[PDB]
Amino acid sequence: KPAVSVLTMFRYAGWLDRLYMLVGTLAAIIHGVALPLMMLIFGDMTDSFASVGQVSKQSTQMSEADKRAMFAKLEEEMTTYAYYYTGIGAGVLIVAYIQVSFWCLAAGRQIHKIRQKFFHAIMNQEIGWFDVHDVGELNTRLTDDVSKINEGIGDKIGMFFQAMATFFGGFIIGFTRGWKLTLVILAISPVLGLSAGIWAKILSSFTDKELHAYAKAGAVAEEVLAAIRTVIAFGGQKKELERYNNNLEEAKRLGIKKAITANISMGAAFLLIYASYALAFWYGTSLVISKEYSIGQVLTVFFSVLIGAFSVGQASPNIEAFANARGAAYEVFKIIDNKPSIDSFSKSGHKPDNIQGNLEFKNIHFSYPSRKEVQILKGLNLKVKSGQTVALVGNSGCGKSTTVQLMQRLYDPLDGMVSIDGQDIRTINVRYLREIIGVVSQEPVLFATTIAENIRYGREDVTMDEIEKAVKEANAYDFIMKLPHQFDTLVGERGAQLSGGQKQRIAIARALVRNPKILLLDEATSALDTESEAVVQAALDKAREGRTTIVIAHRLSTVRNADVIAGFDGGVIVEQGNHDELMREKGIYFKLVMTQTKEALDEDVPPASFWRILKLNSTEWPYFVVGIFCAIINGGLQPAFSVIFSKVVGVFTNGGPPETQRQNSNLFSLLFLILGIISFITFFLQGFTFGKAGEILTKRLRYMVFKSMLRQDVSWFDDPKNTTGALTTRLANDAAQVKGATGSRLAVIFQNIANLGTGIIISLIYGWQLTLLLLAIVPIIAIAGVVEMKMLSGQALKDKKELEGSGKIATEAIENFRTVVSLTREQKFETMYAQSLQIPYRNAMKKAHVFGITFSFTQAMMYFSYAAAFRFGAYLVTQQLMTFENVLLVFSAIVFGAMAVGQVSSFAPDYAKATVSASHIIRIIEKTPEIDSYSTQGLKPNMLEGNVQFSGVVFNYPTRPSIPVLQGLSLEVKKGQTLALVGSSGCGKSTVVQLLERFYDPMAGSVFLDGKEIKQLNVQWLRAQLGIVSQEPILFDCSIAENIAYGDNSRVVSYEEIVRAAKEANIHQFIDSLPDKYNTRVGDKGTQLSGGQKQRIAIARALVRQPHILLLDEATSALDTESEKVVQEALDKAREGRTCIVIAHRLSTIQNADLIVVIQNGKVKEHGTHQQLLAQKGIYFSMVSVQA
Ligand SMILES: [Hg+2]
Ligand SMILES: [Hg+2]
Ligand SMILES: [Hg+2]
Ligand SMILES: [Hg+2]
Ligand SMILES: [Hg+2]
Ligand SMILES: [Hg+2]
Ligand SMILES: [Hg+2]
C-alpha cells in the first residue's frame, strides 16, 4: 500500500491552517494531562480521610476536640480540593473546544482546496489518461478518497496528541509520585501487548479464512439466482437447495472456532488486567505497611499508570486513520501533480484568424496508447482542399476514427504531423483549435437541462435569437416548438426521453453554434432508422456548406455525394479520388459496394419486530440456559470488584488492628486474581454457549431463507428491489448478523442487569443520599453519551446529502468526459462544481463550532461529576454519616458499573442493525407466494393429449401496470399442430409462453390445458411436460450430463436417456469429438462454446423429459451462417407428435406452420395459415413485404 510523506500531505495548509493546528494540538496536549492531574488530586484527597479514620476508630480520646481537628480539618481541605477539581474541569471545556473546533476547522479548509484542485486536475487530464483508467473508480474516488483524506487530518490527530499527552502525563505523574510501584506495573505491561498481539493474529486468521469459505456457497448462490427463471422452469429448486446447503455446514463450522478464540482472547485480556490489579495492590499495600508510600500514593501511581497505558489503546485507531489517509492521498496528489502533454488549459500556441480550413496529414504513423503492440496508422497521407467534403471508406479498422481523433488532436501522432495550412496543429492553441473544429459523434449526447442550456454549452455568450436560428439551421425547430415546455424542456438522462434523430439534431445545433470552419462527422447517421436518417442527413448536408468536412459513414448511400472518396486498406490510404474513379478502378470501395448491395430503499420499508427474533434461535434451549447464568456470573463479577477495591483501601483508611493489615491485604489482592480467574471461565463458557448458538442459527437460517427464496413467484423476482446481488447480499450478511439480536442481546442485558442491578442494591445499603446523587448524575451523562453520537452522525448524514449536489455535477462531467473535452467547456464544469461546493463550505464553520461545544459539553461535565460526588460524599463522611470506605464503594459501584455497561454495550454487535437485518429475514421467510411450486396437490392425470387453449385471459404485468400486455386475446392449439405467433415486437409473444408455464396469473379470463383449467392442475406437474427454449440459453457450471439430465428431475436419468436425447438433438457428434465425453464443464470455467452448440444442448435438455408441449420463444436471434440450419434441423424431427408454439421474427420458417396468429395491441386481429393471411391483404401482408 502506497503512502505520501507526512510533510507533503499538509501542503495545502496556509498561515491560518498552521496557526489552527498548532493552537489545537497545544490545547490537546494540556487536555490530555488533565486526567492524570485529576488522579493526583484524588490521591491527595484520600490521604486526608485516612487520617480521620484511625483516630476515631480505636477506643476514645477526645470527643469535643475531634470535631475541631477532624470535622473542621476536612472541610478546610475539601474547600481547596473542590476548587482544584472544578478549576480543572473549567479548563477542560475550554481546551477541548479549542481542540476539536480548530482541528475540524483547519482540516475542512484544506479539504475544500483539495477536492477543487483534484477536480481541476481530472479535467486537465487528456483522453489518453482516460484510456488506461477506469472512469468508474475515478468518479467514486472523488467522493470516497477525498472524504477519506479528510478523516485523519481533522479531529483524529487532535485526539492522537491528547492520548499521547495522557500517556506521558500518566507516566510522568506515576514516576513523580512513585519510583518502585510504577516500575512494578510497567513490568506487568509487556505481557499484555504480547498477549493482545498474538490473539489479534489468531482471529484475523480465521476472519480472512471465513471469507473464501462462504464464497464457495455464494458461488452457487448467484449462479442460481441469476438463472432462476430457467430454474423455476425446470423446477430444480430441490436440487439447487441441496446444492446450496452442501457448502453451508462447511464454512460456518469453521466460524465457530473463530468465535471461540475471540472469546478466549477477551477472557485472557480480563484475566491479565485483573492479575495486574491483584499484583499492583499486593505490592502497593505491602508497601504502605512499611510506611513508605501512603494509601493515596498507591492509588495515584496505579491509576495514573493504568490510565497512561490504556491511553495507547485509545491512540491506536486515531493514528490508524491518519495512516490510510496518506495512502488515500497518494492517488489524488498523483493526479493533481500530473501535468498532461496537451494543455489545453492555457494558451501557448497561435490563434489564426484567416482561418482558411485546408487539412493535411503528412506521414501519419500512429498507434493507440492502450495497445502499443498494434500499430494503426502507418504513413497516412491525406489532403483536404478548402470547403471540400472528403469521405473515408474501406472498412479497415479503428483507423478511420483515429484520423478524426487525430484531427481534433485528442492523440498526438507517434511519427509525422497533422497540418492545418502552413502551421502545425500543435503550434496552435488547443482551446482555439477545438473552437474552430466541429464534431458530431456516432452516439448523440445531451446533458440534463433545457434544450437551450444544452445549446449554451456550445457557446456561452449566445443570445436566444442565435439559439433559435441555430436550431432552425438544424431542422430541429419543428419538434422543439411542439414540446410542452419549448426550449425550457428538460432532456438528457433524467426526464423527457427523445428519439435518436431528435437528440442528434439538437447536438448538430450545438455544434453549429460554435460556427466551426472544419466539421467532423463520425458515423453520424449510423444507428438510426431510415426515416430519421433522412432528416438528420438533410441538416448535415446544409451544415457542410462553407465548411471543410471530413465524413465517415457505414452506409454508402450518403458517401457518393462527397467531393473525394479515400479508401483504407491496412494502415495506408491506397485509392483516392472521385466516385467514378473508385468505381472504375474496382478497388476496396467497389468491393464494399457490391457486398452491401437500492441500499437505503431496503431497510426503510419493513416495520417490526420487537423480541420476536429470539424465537428463531429458540431451536436451541440448552445453550441459552447455560448462557444466561454465565452472563449473570460475569455480570455480577463487576459489583464484586467495587466491593473488593473498597475493602483494600478500606483497611488503610478505616484504621483497625495493624497486625490485621497484612492479613487482609494479601487476602484482597489474591482475591482479585480469583476475580480474574472466574472472569476467564465465563468468556470460555459463553463462547461454547451463545458462540455456537448464533452460528447454528446462521446456517439453519440461511438454509431457511434460501428455501423460501425459491418458493417465491417470478413476479417477486421482477421487483426492482430484489436483484441477484441484493439477494446474495441479503443472504450473506443480513442472515448471519441476525445472531446479534438473539443470544448476544440476552448476554448483554443479563451482564448489564447483574452488574448495575446488584451493584445498585449494594450501594443502596452502604449509602443512601450519595447513591441517590450518583443515580441522578450518571443517567444524565449517559444521555449525553447518547446525544453525542446523535448529533455526530446526525449532522454527518446532513453534510453528505448536501454534497450529492456537487457529486452529480462531477459525475456527469466525468462520465461524459470524451464529449465535454470536444466542446471545451471544462472550466465551466469546474465553475459549476465550485458554486455547488460553496454551500457546504459555508456551513463548515458552524459545523466546527457545534462539534466543539458538544464535545466540551460531554467532557467538562465528567470532571464536574467527580467534583459533586466527592464534595457531597466528604460532607457525608465528616458528619455522623459513615463512612468514607462506603463513599468510595458506592462511587465505584455505580460509576465503574455504569462504565462497565458501556463496555458490554460496545462488545455485542449493533442491535439496531441486527434487528433491521433480522426483519428482512423474517419477512423473506414468512413470505407466501401466489403460485407455490412446493405444493403436492393437483390433478396429475393419465391423458397425454395436451391441448392448449387461451380463452379471454387478460393480463398486465404486476411490476408495471401501465399499457396492459394482453387485452384478452384468445387462441387454441391441438395436438401435433404447431402455432405461430406474429406481431411487431414482444408483449405478449413471450407472455403467452410465460403464462402457459404459469409464471403469472391473468386478472380475468382463463387458460385451459385439455379440458382442465390450469389453476386446477398441479403447479410443478404442469411444467413437468412443458418444453421451453429461450433466446439466450444458460447452462450450470456443473457438467454436461447433469445439464442434459437437468431436464427431468425426481428420476435417475443414467447414460441411456442422455445418449437417447443426445442423438435426436444431433448433438452427439459434438460430444465424442471434443475431449472428453460428457465430463466437460460449461461454461466460462471450462471450454467456451458458440451460441449454436449451447442452444443444441438446451434443446437436448428440454427433450429428455419427453414433453408433450414445446415452447419456442425467439429461439435463435443471434445465430448465423449454416449453424442455424442444423439447429432447426434437430428441432423439426422432435416437433412431430408434439404440441409446438413458435415465436420468431424470421417469418421465413413460419410459412410451413399449421396455425399463424397475428397479435396486435392486446388482441388477435388476424387468424389463419400463411397463404390465407397473405391473400387477406391485412397487416400480415404489410409485415411480410419487408422480407425483400
Ligand atoms: Hg471534522
Ligand atoms: Hg476506435
Ligand atoms: Hg458470560
Ligand atoms: Hg426485459
Ligand atoms: Hg414484457
Ligand atoms: Hg450445476
Ligand atoms: Hg414449431
mmCIF file of N, CA and C in Angstrom, residues 700-750:
data_model
loop_
_atom_site.group_PDB
_atom_site.id
_atom_site.type_symbol
_atom_site.label_atom_id
_atom_site.label_comp_id
_atom_site.label_asym_id
_atom_site.label_seq_id
_atom_site.Cartn_x
_atom_site.Cartn_y
_atom_site.Cartn_z
ATOM 1 N N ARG A 700 -28.784 -22.672 9.694
ATOM 2 C CA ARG A 700 -30.166 -23.071 9.540
ATOM 3 C C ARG A 700 -30.907 -21.918 8.895
ATOM 4 N N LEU A 701 -30.622 -20.706 9.362
ATOM 5 C CA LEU A 701 -31.359 -19.562 8.869
ATOM 6 C C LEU A 701 -31.104 -19.371 7.383
ATOM 7 N N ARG A 702 -29.840 -19.423 6.954
ATOM 8 C CA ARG A 702 -29.578 -19.226 5.527
ATOM 9 C C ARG A 702 -30.327 -20.282 4.728
ATOM 10 N N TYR A 703 -30.308 -21.515 5.236
ATOM 11 C CA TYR A 703 -30.986 -22.606 4.560
ATOM 12 C C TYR A 703 -32.426 -22.183 4.406
ATOM 13 N N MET A 704 -33.026 -21.781 5.523
ATOM 14 C CA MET A 704 -34.433 -21.458 5.528
ATOM 15 C C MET A 704 -34.674 -20.356 4.523
ATOM 16 N N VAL A 705 -33.812 -19.338 4.577
ATOM 17 C CA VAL A 705 -34.001 -18.170 3.737
ATOM 18 C C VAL A 705 -34.013 -18.633 2.298
ATOM 19 N N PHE A 706 -32.986 -19.396 1.937
ATOM 20 C CA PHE A 706 -32.792 -19.761 0.552
ATOM 21 C C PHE A 706 -33.999 -20.552 0.062
ATOM 22 N N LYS A 707 -34.533 -21.421 0.921
ATOM 23 C CA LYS A 707 -35.665 -22.242 0.510
ATOM 24 C C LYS A 707 -36.822 -21.344 0.142
ATOM 25 N N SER A 708 -37.113 -20.382 1.010
ATOM 26 C CA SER A 708 -38.258 -19.521 0.781
ATOM 27 C C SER A 708 -38.028 -18.690 -0.471
ATOM 28 N N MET A 709 -36.765 -18.388 -0.748
ATOM 29 C CA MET A 709 -36.442 -17.588 -1.916
ATOM 30 C C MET A 709 -36.807 -18.321 -3.200
ATOM 31 N N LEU A 710 -36.704 -19.645 -3.186
ATOM 32 C CA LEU A 710 -37.122 -20.416 -4.352
ATOM 33 C C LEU A 710 -38.643 -20.595 -4.397
ATOM 34 N N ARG A 711 -39.290 -20.517 -3.235
ATOM 35 C CA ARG A 711 -40.743 -20.658 -3.165
ATOM 36 C C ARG A 711 -41.426 -19.473 -3.835
ATOM 37 N N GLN A 712 -40.713 -18.356 -3.896
ATOM 38 C CA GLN A 712 -41.268 -17.105 -4.403
ATOM 39 C C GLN A 712 -41.658 -17.114 -5.878
ATOM 40 N N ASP A 713 -42.548 -16.197 -6.247
ATOM 41 C CA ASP A 713 -43.047 -16.133 -7.613
ATOM 42 C C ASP A 713 -42.063 -15.436 -8.526
ATOM 43 N N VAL A 714 -42.343 -15.483 -9.820
ATOM 44 C CA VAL A 714 -41.472 -14.841 -10.781
ATOM 45 C C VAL A 714 -41.731 -13.346 -10.720
ATOM 46 N N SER A 715 -42.969 -12.977 -10.409
ATOM 47 C CA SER A 715 -43.336 -11.571 -10.278
ATOM 48 C C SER A 715 -42.597 -10.884 -9.127
ATOM 49 N N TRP A 716 -42.176 -11.672 -8.136
ATOM 50 C CA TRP A 716 -41.397 -11.177 -6.998
ATOM 51 C C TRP A 716 -39.946 -10.915 -7.380
ATOM 52 N N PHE A 717 -39.444 -11.702 -8.327
ATOM 53 C CA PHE A 717 -38.090 -11.521 -8.840
ATOM 54 C C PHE A 717 -38.020 -10.384 -9.861
ATOM 55 N N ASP A 718 -39.180 -9.920 -10.312
ATOM 56 C CA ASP A 718 -39.242 -8.790 -11.231
ATOM 57 C C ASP A 718 -39.228 -7.487 -10.458
ATOM 58 N N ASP A 719 -39.425 -7.591 -9.147
ATOM 59 C CA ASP A 719 -39.434 -6.427 -8.282
ATOM 60 C C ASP A 719 -38.040 -5.835 -8.373
ATOM 61 N N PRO A 720 -37.945 -4.559 -8.777
ATOM 62 C CA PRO A 720 -36.642 -3.918 -8.982
ATOM 63 C C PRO A 720 -35.762 -3.946 -7.736
ATOM 64 N N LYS A 721 -36.381 -4.064 -6.567
ATOM 65 C CA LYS A 721 -35.653 -4.038 -5.309
ATOM 66 C C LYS A 721 -34.964 -5.364 -4.978
ATOM 67 N N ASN A 722 -35.364 -6.445 -5.646
ATOM 68 C CA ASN A 722 -34.755 -7.753 -5.386
ATOM 69 C C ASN A 722 -33.887 -8.264 -6.524
ATOM 70 N N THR A 723 -32.600 -7.948 -6.465
ATOM 71 C CA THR A 723 -31.678 -8.330 -7.523
ATOM 72 C C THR A 723 -30.756 -9.429 -7.033
ATOM 73 N N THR A 724 -30.120 -10.129 -7.966
ATOM 74 C CA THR A 724 -29.277 -11.266 -7.609
ATOM 75 C C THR A 724 -28.206 -10.843 -6.623
ATOM 76 N N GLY A 725 -27.722 -9.618 -6.777
ATOM 77 C CA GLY A 725 -26.701 -9.132 -5.880
ATOM 78 C C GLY A 725 -27.336 -8.756 -4.561
ATOM 79 N N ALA A 726 -28.574 -8.274 -4.611
ATOM 80 C CA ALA A 726 -29.267 -7.819 -3.408
ATOM 81 C C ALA A 726 -29.729 -9.017 -2.608
ATOM 82 N N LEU A 727 -30.081 -10.074 -3.324
ATOM 83 C CA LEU A 727 -30.481 -11.313 -2.686
ATOM 84 C C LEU A 727 -29.277 -12.047 -2.106
ATOM 85 N N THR A 728 -28.165 -12.059 -2.835
ATOM 86 C CA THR A 728 -26.989 -12.765 -2.337
ATOM 87 C C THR A 728 -26.370 -11.980 -1.171
ATOM 88 N N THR A 729 -26.543 -10.657 -1.188
ATOM 89 C CA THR A 729 -26.095 -9.784 -0.101
ATOM 90 C C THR A 729 -26.982 -9.963 1.117
ATOM 91 N N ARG A 730 -28.282 -10.089 0.878
ATOM 92 C CA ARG A 730 -29.241 -10.349 1.944
ATOM 93 C C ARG A 730 -28.924 -11.696 2.595
ATOM 94 N N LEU A 731 -28.470 -12.626 1.762
ATOM 95 C CA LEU A 731 -28.221 -13.995 2.183
ATOM 96 C C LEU A 731 -26.876 -14.150 2.874
ATOM 97 N N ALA A 732 -25.920 -13.312 2.491
ATOM 98 C CA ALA A 732 -24.565 -13.382 3.028
ATOM 99 C C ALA A 732 -24.399 -12.647 4.355
ATOM 100 N N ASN A 733 -24.929 -11.435 4.429
ATOM 101 C CA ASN A 733 -24.731 -10.594 5.600
ATOM 102 C C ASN A 733 -25.907 -10.628 6.566
ATOM 103 N N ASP A 734 -27.076 -10.188 6.104
ATOM 104 C CA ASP A 734 -28.217 -9.981 6.995
ATOM 105 C C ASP A 734 -28.620 -11.250 7.742
ATOM 106 N N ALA A 735 -28.439 -12.403 7.105
ATOM 107 C CA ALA A 735 -28.809 -13.664 7.739
ATOM 108 C C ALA A 735 -27.860 -14.023 8.878
ATOM 109 N N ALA A 736 -26.581 -13.724 8.689
ATOM 110 C CA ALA A 736 -25.574 -14.068 9.681
ATOM 111 C C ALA A 736 -25.581 -13.099 10.852
ATOM 112 N N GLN A 737 -25.980 -11.856 10.604
ATOM 113 C CA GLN A 737 -25.878 -10.827 11.630
ATOM 114 C C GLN A 737 -27.070 -10.874 12.556
ATOM 115 N N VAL A 738 -28.034 -11.720 12.212
ATOM 116 C CA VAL A 738 -29.253 -11.838 12.995
ATOM 117 C C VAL A 738 -28.923 -12.319 14.409
ATOM 118 N N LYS A 739 -27.785 -12.996 14.555
ATOM 119 C CA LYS A 739 -27.404 -13.561 15.840
ATOM 120 C C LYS A 739 -27.073 -12.446 16.821
ATOM 121 N N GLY A 740 -26.854 -11.254 16.271
ATOM 122 C CA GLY A 740 -26.588 -10.059 17.049
ATOM 123 C C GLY A 740 -27.799 -9.640 17.857
ATOM 124 N N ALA A 741 -28.978 -10.027 17.382
ATOM 125 C CA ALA A 741 -30.213 -9.650 18.053
ATOM 126 C C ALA A 741 -30.874 -10.779 18.864
ATOM 127 N N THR A 742 -30.227 -11.940 18.949
ATOM 128 C CA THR A 742 -30.819 -13.068 19.676
ATOM 129 C C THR A 742 -30.123 -13.376 21.006
ATOM 130 N N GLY A 743 -29.006 -14.094 20.956
ATOM 131 C CA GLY A 743 -28.369 -14.536 22.185
ATOM 132 C C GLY A 743 -27.446 -13.499 22.788
ATOM 133 N N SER A 744 -26.786 -12.747 21.914
ATOM 134 C CA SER A 744 -25.814 -11.747 22.321
ATOM 135 C C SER A 744 -26.530 -10.689 23.134
ATOM 136 N N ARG A 745 -27.758 -10.384 22.735
ATOM 137 C CA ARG A 745 -28.558 -9.396 23.438
ATOM 138 C C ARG A 745 -29.034 -9.866 24.807
ATOM 139 N N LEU A 746 -29.320 -11.153 24.928
ATOM 140 C CA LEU A 746 -29.619 -11.703 26.237
ATOM 141 C C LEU A 746 -28.377 -11.631 27.121
ATOM 142 N N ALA A 747 -27.220 -11.940 26.549
ATOM 143 C CA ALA A 747 -25.980 -11.877 27.312
ATOM 144 C C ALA A 747 -25.741 -10.453 27.795
ATOM 145 N N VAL A 748 -25.905 -9.484 26.899
ATOM 146 C CA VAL A 748 -25.674 -8.079 27.225
ATOM 147 C C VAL A 748 -26.648 -7.564 28.269
ATOM 148 N N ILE A 749 -27.907 -7.957 28.123
ATOM 149 C CA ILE A 749 -28.952 -7.484 29.017
ATOM 150 C C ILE A 749 -28.809 -8.115 30.409
ATOM 151 N N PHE A 750 -28.294 -9.344 30.450
ATOM 152 C CA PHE A 750 -28.052 -10.022 31.722
ATOM 153 C C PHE A 750 -26.750 -9.605 32.438
#
